[PDB]
Design a protein around this ligand. Structure first.
Ligand SMILES: [Zn+2]
Lengths: 117, 275, 72, 283
């Protein structure tokens, strides 16, 4: 939909500007994208919060130094996915290793994170 | 300005080593303590405190008391506060502390063999006779003077194991207290508050249950039974920048402390003795 | 433009560095400081990209980030 | 930020292991004494100060040649009258714990020794004790990890090259008494093998060989051995009899009228022991 744009080089990753959200479909492909946007760190705007914003469910650490996390999220219409967030966050439960994630999301994350030097 | 800061009479006899001695000012207080607050905290996990008893007009009985610095998860050695002479060497990592501090501890526990061993080892320091022996003399004399001062036998009805309901039999915590040195006994008296205070047939109860435990291992910040008491505790950075400029706040707070409450103090016909 | 945090950090660090260069004994800035990043000509003042104004309780530093970007 | 992403910078590096000694008690500031030599990128991984303090050894150079090659060599600081344990120039893994007074020195240095000497049990004991001693989490843990990482980095730099040298064919060294008709030499090579890789490198850098065969030419620096190796380790003892007089003139009128500016032979006792062989120069 027009609410977001598919990230270049990804079949299951998109970004919603008005929401400032990067999302990765758990098991689903994107389709119909006539446009794509190059990934860039600015997209992961650091969320400011005097007390760390609490998070629930499955949480994974991407960059502890940069307060980057991956949060399991299901769209109310029951669409599984993960949200990549950067900011002052804390986890209600124990943080989980990324290896737990499926190869699909893992490949997308590698593409999005490792700079193409 | 007598500095009673035992464990600050430590001199880094090694030239390459400099002892900061960053310890608490209260050592210059002519109190019943022979060890000031920071030494107490560091080496016994205790924080000095005072417990007023009668504070109405001028009767100002202010019994002293220290606080646990032990959480509700530590156990065994981690929980022991004042180890016995049989286990203090193990509880304290003497090897990790300066030999002068080790000497102080050995004197406190009457480990003369360890004292002799330490001075024998110091015998083989490069500047041994020049200044190592002078340091030995200074530290040893200071510690011995403090110990003699503490010891009452030199030139009252406080029972520490007599509070423990549900104990099978025996007490003997007072036995070990007797076995302790004068300095250790005075420290225990100064820091531990008897749960009961009887004056001329007048009993005051401060707690419904004692907080400390005394056994062969020594003084332990353990409970008489059940689980342990809950005991919680610029270089401008990017994170230090705060965001946009923009719940019982109105009520006072009861401390989440665990003061040393254990024992029964009996006072004879003597009245409210305030000297 | 999004990461105002870093802009404010850099500006304050520079200001404190200059302040110390004038008063070497000073390593902080005492009173807390506010920061705002203008984004329009009608919000910016020519010739003074960085300026100051108190809110009657504490000083606020105004930054013309577009002008800074243009210069650099 | 200023520097390129990562881009490991290039600078000098202090090389003596003991430079990393620091008081685990963060409230106690300490500075270890390091000789400036530590900042020379050479085979020595110990500075002159630590070397003299702990091993009783002083560095030295031996010119070799047309092209003047400089071979590293250490020398005795052991006096003539020292006896027994005092004669242990470098203790073995079975005696260092005793020769070095672990109790009298800092815990960090004790860990350094238990790392150099392959004493994993002692290293683990120290690590666990520090875990359960003092404010380990706050900064003591990070300091300990830094010291351990530095020591392990030095050891990982040294040991691979040491093993390659051991199995090397072109370069061969034999730490024993070249006078095979002697009893104080023994299985010096076996003892050297027993030593750790980094310790083996130190021994190589310190003890020069009595002879040196380069290709077809042999140079005999001594008609005798100035030190030996036994189970105790490197011993500053004369293999054949009376100890060599070591005046130790420094550190720890007609005669001069005649002996004005006048070439003087040093009284130092360098380390000469064993046989060394090399093909080509490799220099
Ligand atoms: Zn050094």
């Amino acid at each position: 939909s027009k609410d977001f744009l598919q990230l270049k080089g990804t079949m299951n990753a998109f970004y919603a500007p008005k929401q400032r959200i990067l999302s990765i479909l758990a098991v689903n492909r994107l389709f119909g994208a006539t446009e794509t946007i190059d990934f860039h760190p600015n997209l992961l705007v650091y969320r400011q919060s005097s007390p760390p914003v609490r998070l629930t469910g499955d949480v994974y650490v991407v960059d502890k130094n940069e307060k980057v996390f991956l949060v399991k999220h299901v769209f109310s219409n029951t669409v599984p996915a993960y949200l990549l967030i950067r900011g002052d966050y804390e986890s209600s439960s124990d943080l989980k290793s990324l290896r737990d994630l499926n190869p699909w999301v893992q490949n997308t994350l590698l593409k999005l994170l490792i700079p193409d030097s | 300005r007598v500095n009673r800061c035992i464990f600050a009479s430590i001199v880094s006899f090694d030239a390459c080593i400099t002892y900061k001695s960053p310890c608490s000012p209260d050592a210059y207080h002519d109190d019943g303590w022979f060890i000031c607050n920071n030494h107490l905290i560091k080496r016994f996990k205790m924080s000095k405190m005072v417990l007023p008893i009668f504070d109405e007009d001028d009767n100002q009985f202010k019994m002293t008391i220290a606080r646990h610095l032990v959480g509700n998860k530590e156990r065994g050695i981690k929980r022991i506060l004042i180890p016995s002479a049989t286990n203090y060497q193990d509880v304290f990592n003497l090897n990790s502390m300066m030999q002068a501090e080790q000497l102080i501890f050995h004197l406190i526990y009457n480990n003369e063999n360890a004292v002799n061993t330490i001075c024998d080892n110091l015998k083989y320091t490069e500047g041994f006779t020049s200044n190592t022996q002078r340091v030995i003399h200074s530290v040893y004399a200071t510690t011995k003077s403090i110990l003699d001062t503490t010891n009452p036998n030199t030139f009252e009805l406080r029972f520490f194991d007599v509070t423990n309901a549900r104990a099978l039999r025996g007490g003997a915590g007072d036995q070990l207290f007797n076995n302790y040195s004068g300095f250790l006994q005075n420290l225990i008296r100064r820091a531990v508050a008897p749960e009961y205070l009887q004056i001329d047939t007048e009993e005051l109860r401060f707690r419904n249950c004692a907080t400390c435990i005394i056994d062969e291992t020594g003084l332990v910040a353990s409970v008489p039974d059940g689980p342990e008491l809950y005991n919680p505790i610029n270089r401008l950075q990017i994170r230090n920048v705060l965001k946009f400029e923009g719940t019982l706040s109105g009520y006072e707070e009861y401390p989440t402390y665990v003061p040393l409450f254990l024992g029964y103090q009996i006072i004879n016909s003597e009245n409210n003795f305030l000297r | 433009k999004a990461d105002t945090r870093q802009i404010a950090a850099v500006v304050f660090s520079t200001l404190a560095f200059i302040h110390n260069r004038f008063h070497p004994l000073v390593t902080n800035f005492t009173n807390k400081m506010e920061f705002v990043v203008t984004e329009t000509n009608d919000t910016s003042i020519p010739g003074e990209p960085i300026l100051f104004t108190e809110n009657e309780g504490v000083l606020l530093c105004s930054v013309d980030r577009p002008s800074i970007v243009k210069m650099l």
